[PDB]
């Protein structure tokens, strides 16, 4: 369904955000 | 659908958020 | 619809967040 | 509707989030 | 309804996040 | 219902996020 | 259901964000 697909897009975008936050943590402690 | 379109807009906005965080992680290094 | 409008308000608020996060990165460099 | 109203509550909270992030950006300078 | 109640819990959690971001900004000053 | 349960999971994950942001704030100062 | 499953994927991604933030906090302290 279109609605379920769009919710999965939201999840994927948040997994992007998480990756970016993990990079901030690594850049900080370095 | 209007609801699905709006959910995709939320996703797009979160992808903008992730890009911003990736830039923060880059800035934090140098 | 009222639900779709509210979801668009959520999207807009997140675009505000992204602009702010961008300004944080600029302030860092 | 109560669902639309709750979704608007979520957007309002995210606009709070953005305001605070804009304050972080100002503080980093 | 259960769905509206859960959405409000989501907003409540984001207000917590906003309060934490205001605190981070405060620490940065 | 499963949708309400999943929304409550999102709320709980955001409360996790808020706790972590509070830990960042603390670590800052 | 597909919608419920997608919503749980959003929650999973946010728990990923939380883990990353807990790592950022550990890095700020050292």
For the beta carbon of residue F15, count every other beta carbon within 10 angstroms: 19
The DSSP symbol for D28 reads: T
The minimum CA-CA distance between D22 and chain E, rounded to whole Å, is 9
What would the two tokens of residue B17 be? 């958020």
Q: Are G7 and A9 in contact (CB under 8 A)?
A: no
Whether B29 contacts chain C with CB within 8 A = no
Q: Where are the alpha helices (DSSP H) in A1-30?
A: 2-28
Q: Considering only CB atoms, which chain F residues are within 8 Å of G3?
A: 3
- Dist CA F26 CA E24 (whole Å): 8
Experimental technique of record: X-ray
Chain position carrying tokens 């379920």:
A4
Where in chain A are the domains?
Answer: 1-30
- F22, closest residue in chain G (CA to CA): G25
When CB atoms are compared, the residue of F3, F6, F27 closest to G11 is F6
Whether B26 contacts chain C with CB within 8 A = yes
Please give the distance of CA D28 from its chain centroid, rounded to a whole number: 20
Q: Are C27 and B26 in contact (CB under 8 A)?
A: no
Whether D19 contacts chain E with CB within 8 A = yes
SS3 G1: coil
Resolution in A: 1.8
Residue G29 phi, psi dihedral angles, 5° rounding: -80, -10
What would the two tokens of residue A7 be? 């919710």
| The residue count for chain A | 30
What would the two tokens of residue D1 be? 């509707």
Contact B25 A30 (CB under 8 A): no
Please report, for residues A16, D9, E9, G30, the alpha-carbon distance to residue E13 in angstroms, rounded to integers and kept in the order given. Answer: 21, 11, 6, 28
Q: Angle between the A2-28 and G2-28 helix axes, to the nearest 10 degrees?
A: 10
| The residue count for chain B | 30
Could you tell me which residues come within 8 angstroms of residue G19 by beta carbon, excluding any fewer than 6 positions away? A18, F20
Torsion on CA atoms E13, E17, E18, E19, rounded to nearest 10:
100
Q: Considering only CB atoms, which chain B residues are within 8 Å of A4?
A: none
What would the two tokens of residue D29 be? 């300078």
Which of A29, A24, E9 is CA-nearest to residue C24?
Answer: A24
Contact G12 A7 (CB under 8 A): no
- Dist CA E25 CA F11 (whole Å): 24
Start-to-end C-alpha separation, chain B: 44
């Amino acid at each position: 369904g279109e609605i379920a697909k769009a919710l999965r897009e939201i999840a994927k975008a948040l997994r992007e955000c998480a990756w970016a936050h993990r990079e901030e943590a690594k850049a900080l402690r370095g």
